[PDB]
């Protein structure tokens, strides 16, 4: 379970912004490995959780899950206050089977990335238009 | 039950700050000896309570307890009122037995102080990263 | 991270020293336990600290730290080093979720250096209520 400070390069509305993330420990309760943004407040920071799972006799499949939680908090007008306002969740959930090879798994991951870069999907998400 | 104005030296994020505390009376209801910070408002002041106890036939042990309650207020919210916003509790509870000597008791207290000064614990508390 | 941790200058007179090697996190509840190497399976002074995350019910961090150290007993014709008296001490903080770092550390430091002040020292060494 290796971790490191991960930089994210060319992510933004334009593609010029960069992001830095530092690791903040594996939670052994449910396998949740968290990464966070270097902030003092524990409730005003962008955070990214990732958790590979294991198959029991209940579900019998791998279940990879990635959550992203960006919370934008607005200015507090009076003097000094600061308060969280709105949330912006994000979820990714792969359901890879037992006998899958790594070629088709990487094919799914590359396909999801390239489809996130498509013009149709940024038409659907960034402007909230339905599909066309 | 002696009391005095207690100064706290080199407590802070850097270790340069000092604190002054003045005594504000033993409450005879439950043995709670309180110390406080010299403020006018009775709800915007850092306070430290300490209460040694006694053994009944119920629990049969000494039970020393120290509470610390720091509250940081926030200022104007469209009016000049200096109202309270957040609490920050702290609790310490020793459970010393009857036949304990003072060497092992002072060993526990010195151990707790030196472990509060360790780098691991300020990694865990000041940055909240789980260890 | 974890590390061998060594207490320095700690004791009744402060000349004693202590050292620990972590025994590893217990997965079930997250308790992280350090220990001081002592050969016996059970005479070891041990110290455990595990910090939670705000659950659905309460919403505020609750760092908690125990310290529990027992003691030995004499030979009874069988060498077993049995344990008699415990001496638990626990410390718990509960800062709310919006608190900044400066506030959080301040309380930690204060607790630590408060103990050195004589008022605490008489009470703890000597059980004479302040």
């Amino acid at each position, epitope marked *: 379970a290796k971790l490191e400070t991960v930089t994210l390069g060319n992510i933004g509305k334009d593609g010029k912004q960069t992001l830095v993330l530092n690791p903040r420990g594996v939670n052994p309760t449910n396998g949740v490995a968290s990464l966070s943004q270097a902030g003092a407040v524990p409730a005003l920071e962008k955070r990214v959780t990732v958790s590979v799972s294991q198959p029991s006799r209940n579900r019998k499949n791998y279940k990879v899950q990635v959550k992203i939680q960006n919370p934008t908090a607005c200015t507090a007008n009076g003097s*000094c206050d600061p308060s969280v306002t709105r949330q912006a969740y994000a979820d990714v959930t792969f359901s890879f089977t037992q006998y899958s090879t790594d070629e088709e798994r990487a094919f799914v991951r590359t396909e999801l990335a390239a489809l996130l870069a498509s013009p149709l999907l940024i038409d659907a998400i960034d402007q909230l238009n339905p599909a066309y | 039950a002696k009391l005095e104005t207690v100064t706290l030296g080199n407590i802070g994020k*850097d270790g340069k700050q000092t604190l002054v505390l003045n005594p504000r009376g033993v409450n005879p209801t439950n043995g709670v000896a309180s110390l406080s910070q010299a403020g006018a408002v009775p709800a915007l002041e850092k306070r430290v309570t300490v209460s040694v106890s006694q053994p009944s036939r119920n629990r049969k042990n000494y039970k020393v307890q120290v509470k610390i309650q720091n*509250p940081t207020a926030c200022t*104007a919210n469209g009016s*000049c009122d200096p109202s309270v916003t957040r609490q920050a509790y702290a609790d310490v509870t020793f459970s010393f037995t009857q036949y304990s000597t003072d060497e092992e008791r002072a060993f526990v207290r010195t151990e707790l102080a030196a472990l509060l000064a360790s780098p691991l614990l300020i990694d865990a508390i000041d940055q909240l990263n789980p260890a | 991270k974890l590390e061998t941790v060594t207490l320095g200058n700690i004791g009744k007179d402060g000349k004693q020293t202590l050292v620990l090697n972590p025994r590893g996190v217990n997965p079930t509840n997250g308790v992280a336990s350090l220990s001081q190497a002592g050969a016996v399976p059970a005479l070891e002074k041990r110290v455990t600290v595990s910090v939670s995350q705000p659950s659905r019910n309460r919403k505020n961090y609750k760092v908690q730290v125990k310290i529990q150290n027992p003691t030995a007993c004499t030979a009874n014709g069988s060498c077993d080093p049995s344990v008699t008296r415990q001496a638990y001490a626990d410390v718990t903080f509960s800062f709310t979720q919006y608190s*900044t770092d400066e506030e959080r550390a301040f309380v930690r430091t204060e607790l630590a250096a408060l103990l050195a002040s004589p008022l605490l020292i008489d009470a703890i060494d000597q059980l004479n209520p302040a």
Partner: antibody
Amino acid sequence: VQLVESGGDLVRPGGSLKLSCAASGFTFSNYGMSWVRQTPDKRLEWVATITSGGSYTYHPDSLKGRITISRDNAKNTLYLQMSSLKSEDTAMFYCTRRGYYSGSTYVDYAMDYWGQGTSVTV
Amino acid sequence: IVITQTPAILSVSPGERVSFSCRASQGIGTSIHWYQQRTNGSPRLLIKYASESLSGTPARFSGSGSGTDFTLSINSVESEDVGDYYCQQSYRWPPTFGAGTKLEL
């Protein structure tokens, strides 16, 4: 201990500027600076603070949109982002330390180790 | 709070002491300071929290006062310790400083 800054151009009205100070001796992650403006005849007034982490940024109520502080912990410097300069509030700037704080409120405050000063003039 | 202080100018010989009267409009719980603006430089602390003297200050400086009217009561005016003595207050909301005071000989 040096706290030298440099942002001192002659700026047209309505414009904007950016100035920063370095710090030595003081470990920068440990503290939180604040700017203090000295009106160029005698008097003084507080500009804005920031905390130790850089999240909470405290302003005054008189000017709100004109000032934002960014804190750069990696290079021991903080940036004062000034925008929409009004006329006649051009004066020298200084950076404080937050050396000797107390009280419950954060902005109960003390100011040692002042800077050198850079003029801003319209 | 409007913090005022009464002497606009002052003159003493280098032997005689002098006090600087300051007055707060609303009560402040012993939370003011004192700064020492020299001629062509930057200020510095003299008196912390209206009574506590630092190590960087000279021992001649001394301040006192509780509740409303605060002052520093410098006991020996050593030559070329001159300038502009601003007052500052840290209660309420926006901290606001004093107007100014001269200390020529």
